Structure formats: C-alpha cells, structure tokens
Design a protein around this ligand. Sequence first.
Ligand SMILES: *[C@H](O)[C@H](C[C@@H]1CCNC1=O)NC(=O)[C@H](CC(C)C)NC(=O)OCc1cc(F)c(F)cc1F
Ligand SMILES: *[C@H](O)[C@H](C[C@@H]1CCNC1=O)NC(=O)[C@H](CC(C)C)NC(=O)OCc1cc(F)c(F)cc1F
Lengths: 302, 302
Amino acid sequence: SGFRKMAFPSGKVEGCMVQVTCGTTTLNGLWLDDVVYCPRHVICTSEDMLNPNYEDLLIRKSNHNFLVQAGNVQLRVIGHSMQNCVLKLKVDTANPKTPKYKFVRIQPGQTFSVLACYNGSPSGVYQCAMRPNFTIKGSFLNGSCGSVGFNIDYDCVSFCYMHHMELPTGVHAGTDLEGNFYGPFVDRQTAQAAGTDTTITVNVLAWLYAAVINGDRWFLNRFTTTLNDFNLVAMKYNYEPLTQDHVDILGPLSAQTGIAVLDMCASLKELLQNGMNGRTILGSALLEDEFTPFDVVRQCSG
Amino acid sequence: SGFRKMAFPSGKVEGCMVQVTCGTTTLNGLWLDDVVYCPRHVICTSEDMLNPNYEDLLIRKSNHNFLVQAGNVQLRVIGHSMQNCVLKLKVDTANPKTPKYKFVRIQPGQTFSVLACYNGSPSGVYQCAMRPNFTIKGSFLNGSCGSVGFNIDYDCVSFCYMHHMELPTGVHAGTDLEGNFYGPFVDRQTAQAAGTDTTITVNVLAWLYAAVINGDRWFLNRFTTTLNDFNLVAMKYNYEPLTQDHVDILGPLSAQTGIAVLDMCASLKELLQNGMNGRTILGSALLEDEFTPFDVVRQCSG
Ligand SMILES: *[C@H](O)[C@H](C[C@@H]1CCNC1=O)NC(=O)[C@H](CC(C)C)NC(=O)OCc1cc(F)c(F)cc1F
Ligand SMILES: *[C@H](O)[C@H](C[C@@H]1CCNC1=O)NC(=O)[C@H](CC(C)C)NC(=O)OCc1cc(F)c(F)cc1F
C-alpha cells in the first residue's frame, strides 16, 4: 500500500566514492578495482574553465599532481588517462568493496538513483529521470561533480551517470561512465541551453496504472481511443508520441489491472483536456512522468 | 541548484537487516551488536491476529522456534524477550557491521529515511514525515514489517521507526525501536482509524524558504502579519498553529534569505486564500509540508 518515489539502496555505491584533488580543485571520484573515474574538469583552474584545452592541461600533469583520498587513507596514483570527458586514475590499491558492476548508457525516459556526494562523502540519495532533452532535475551544489547515478539489479550495480554541470535553468547535465555527455553539452564554464523538454508519455501511463493498483479510479472512463488519435492529442500538449513498443511494455500492468492500454490512453486524453478539477492522483495535482513501467512493477504488487 | 526530496545514504543500515522467521511468518529484523529487534507479531498465526495475547504466545515459544538469517548465514538464537511491541532475539554473533547508533523517539513533523526491506533484503529508500496524527505516508507491502526509519548525523545512525501495519486509508503505522507505537494504534489485525490530519505549518514555511533560496520569488509580497493573525488563518485551513519556538527554528533560513518569518507567513496566508493561480513552487502545484527546516538547510547552500 502506498506509492513513493524510491531510490535504490546506496550502500554498494557508497563504498566506491573517493575524493580527487588536483591543485585547488576537489571533486568526487568513483573507485572500482584499481581505477578511479572522475570528471576531467578537475584539472582546470580559474581561467581554464571558459574554454579549456584538456589535452594540453593533461600533458602538463603528472601522477603526483593527483591526490586521491578514500576516507582517511591516501591512495597512490600510478597512472592517468583521459577518456572523453572522464579522467581515469590508476591507483596502487584495488577497492576491496568493489561491487559487481556494469557501465550502461541509458535512453531518455529511463530513471536512476543519484548518490549526491561532497568531498568523497555521500550526502543523500534520490531518484531522477533522464529527460527527453538529456537533462536531469537533480539537486547539486558546488563540489558535487563526480557524483554518480545508478540502478541495481540482483546485486549488480549498473552505473549510468556522472555529474558535471548545471544549466542556467537550474537543471543538470553529465556523462555516462565512459565520459560521453548525454545531450549536446560540453564541459566548459559557459551558459548552455537545453532543447525544449517534453513529457514522457509512457511513464505517465505507468503512473496512472500505479494509481489504479493503489485504488485511485476516479479518472477512468468507458471511452477508448486509437493510438493515432491519442498521439494527435499528445502532440498538442507536448507529450512524446506513444509507440507500439511502449504499448507492449505496458502489457504487464495492463494485464494486472484489466485496463487495456488504449483505455488508459483515453483517460490520459481526458485528463489533458479537462484537468483534474481539484482532485489528485497518488497525492499529486500534476501528472507525474518520472516513473518507468519497471519502477511501477518493482514497487507495486497485487 | 535544485531541490529534491532526499533520503540519507542507507549503507550503514543495510548491513543491519536480517530475516526473522517464526513458523510460517517471515519479516525483517534489525541486527545490532548481538541482538535482533523485530515486530512481536512475528509470533502470531492466522487466528491469533484478530486479538493476540502476546505474553501467552511468547511463553509457548523457545529459542529454536526463531530462525534468523543474515544473508545466507543462519544466526543461532540464544535468548528472547519482548519489550512493548518489539521482540528482542539474542544471537550468538555480534554484527560486525554495527554502526554507531542511537534509538530516538521523534516528534510529529520530523522526517526520516525509510529502508524498505523484504525477506531481510533492502528494496529501496525514501523519505517520510511523522504526520501530526502519527501515521506516515509510506510504501509498504506484505513482508515489509520490521523495515526501519532513521536519520544519520556524522556517521551515527539514529533509529526512530520500525514498521508494523497499514491502515484502511493506505497510510502506515509503527513503533519506536523500544516497541512503543506512535499514535493510538495497536498491533492487531483490525481496521484502525487515525485522527484527522493537519498540515505541518513550520515545514511549509521551511519549503517556501527553500524555494526562495532556489530563485522562486513570485509568491512573496510586501505585506506582513502578526503571529496571532496568522494562526487564525491557519486554523481555517487545517494548518498547525505556528509557535514562537517554530519562528526561532526558522531563524537561520530567514537570515540567509533576508525575509522575516512573519513576512513569509504573509505569503503563506495569501497562498492559502488565493491558491497558486496555475503557478508552481519548486515544481509543486500543492504546498509541501514534509521538509523540516533542518532538511532545507542540509540540502540548500548559498
Ligand atoms: C561540479 O561540481 C559543478 C557542479 C555544479 C556546481 C553548482 N551545481 C552544479 O551542479 N560543475 C561546474 O561547476 C561546471 C564546471 C565546468 C568546468 C564544466 N560549471 C557549471 O556548472 O557552470 C554552470 C554555468 C556556467 C555559466 F558560465 C553560466 F553562465 C551559467 C551556468 F549555469
Ligand atoms: C507486516 O509486514 C504488515 C505490513 C502491512 C502489510 C501490507 N502493507 C503493510 O504495511 N503488517 C500487517 O500485516 C499487520 C499485522 C498485524 C498483526 C499488526 N496488519 C495490518 O496491517 O492490517 C491492516 C488492516 C487490517 C484489517 F483487518 C483491516 F480491516 C484493514 C487493514 F488495513
């Protein structure tokens, strides 16, 4: 009973967070086996940030320019390299707490847990969706770079995000763990604009199924719609098109509730056209689009 | 930048969760030093649940009736006792991962992180407030009992909640770690009603300060109010009275934003009387009351 935005338990990742210092710049790194991963802008200084030439900056560095601190213990850096926008620091000690892990590059609309960290020390955990415009709506202050996002599946941690920057609109941008930015962003100290965002339709439908599973039924109707006709209304309200692949993904939730997917689409259409009229769904006065179908199944039951 | 509902990192608690089995009943326990804490209704059966006599049920049990599983390892139960609504199981092994910890009984309006668990295995983490009617709005399924709520302060875990039951309205009730229920509830398989709930005024004000710190200023006004006059309007909208102690607690946030507390009260009064007119605050169309002043300061900065 109840439905909450829920993060994965963070213990397996907490044991991987370290502090990386280069000069007067300190941020977080991810320590897996004998490698530490961190954002390459740790090697920048005050005037570098505007438009840094990272290959030049890195060639001017040596191993002893990097300070890695794991709790109170200093780790010796014995090699360094740059891969896209991430720095990889080889250290003399393999992390004894390295979980089973993978690196994954996620698609827009997928969610993950963020372990916000400062100075190598975890601060809090929360759930984020990769927006269609490749930003996330996080909570990050100075010193948070190198915090990572992840999913957990049977004690295997899939890392999918490393934090690098904030945009002027207060949203956030970063890379996969191979250092490739999500979206068009670059790691420079400049105001960068994201594309216009859209609402993740398949997630809104998943969340309406969660509401029914939890006993919220007031928005259902007897009407039905075609997929093409639903997507015409979706365009008008800046919702992503719903594909047949999305319909199939909602299959299990549709089977558990007995509500056909295109039936739930007819409910969403009426909610988009008439509003909620002062009612709420799962406690929300706005339609929620940061729960995937997987998130709903993981948390709901019978 | 950004403001998110954020849980504490859960690693220190994950290493304390075990499975407790009595007969065909399985739930979660908390393993600290050589004691396992769990809800006493683990010793109930099908017909016991309606109105169990727990002292009778426990006198009919012996140590070997309790199965404790820590991961794959079985722990030997070498003693047992009941304290209020919690069972305490002495085991032959002290938990090597026992954090520094305290047991605390919290006041309504305070928040904590919940580590939802099933079969001794952590499932997810989320933040909850103890409501004025001593329920929490959680997400708990069959098998979740014994999941705990906690706060963390400089690597000391303060445990404040253990989960025992759901109410017919879909909210949740439980005990402190000494086994005393929050609120009037009892651990019987019966429909129990909570008192009428009210909104946590000091938390709503804290969250309005978070919005200003984050650049949301549209709800401010030039007007001001007295505390007595604010509390007359609070009663009309089912808000808790604001005390001078609450005003003092909001001191730091007021000093950082330059907005006097009674000035922010005048904003809240106008929001209560006129609504938001289709605008949002920190992404919310409803006023949020599950962030304490401490939560805001912990997460916000300059
Ligand atoms: C790394 O810790 C930090 C995270 C930021 C800091 C505040 N909240 C965050 O998420 N990342 C940065 O500070 C990056 C460093 C660059 C070298 C990549 N810069 C950044 O986020 O700048 C944002 C920015 C910059 C300019 F110039 C603007 F005009 C607006 C703006 F939002
Ligand atoms: C323990 O795991 C479980 C947690 C519940 C199960 C579903 N969601 C939860 O949070 N606790 C219980 O099942 C307790 C056991 C009692 C012996 C304390 N019962 C319970 O929650 O019942 C709720 C209930 C009971 C009756 F009879 C009703 F009519 C309504 C109702 F909500």
